[PDB]
Amino acid sequence: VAYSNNSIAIPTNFTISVTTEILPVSMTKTSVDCTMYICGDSTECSNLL
Amino acid sequence: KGIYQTSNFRVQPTESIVRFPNITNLCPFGEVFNATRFASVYAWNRKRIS
Ligand SMILES: *[C@@H]1O[C@H](CO)[C@@H](O)[C@H](O)[C@H]1NC(C)=O
Numbered sequence: 001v002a003y004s005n006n007s008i009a010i011p012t013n014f015t016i017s018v019t020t021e022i023l024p025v026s027m028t029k030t031s032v033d034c035t036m037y038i039c040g041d042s043t044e045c046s047n048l049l
Numbered sequence: 050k051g052i053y054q055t056s057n058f059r060v061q062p063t064e065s066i067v068r069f070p071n072i073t074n075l076c077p078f079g080e081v082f083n084a085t086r087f088a089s090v091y092a093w094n095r096k097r098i099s
Binding site for chain 2: 031035040
């Protein structure tokens with residue numbers, strides 16, 4: 001930067017620009033049946049659960 | 050007042066199904082258990098059952 005105690009820089013034109021910003025909002029709504037995942041259709045295993 | 054998740058369901062078992070190949074013969078366990086001579090432990094005999 002060409003710094004000085006009496007020199008300033010003033011822009012003479014401008015450029016309009018468009019920027020893209022991506023942010024997550026939601027998440028996949030999962031649902032797990034705990035009894036089914038541990039052991040399916042087993043009454044003896046469900047009794048131990 | 051609200052929505053509530055409950056237990057998973059599946060249809061109850063109605064009967065038992067057994068599906069085996071239609072084999073009729075019996076392997077001779079008589080020559081294994083009622084055998085006359087038994088081999089030694091250093092020359093143990095192996096018999097295939099199928
Ligand atoms: C083997 O010996 C037992 C004991 O007497 C007898 O009951 C059985 O019938 C015998 N089996 C054969 C195939 O001889």
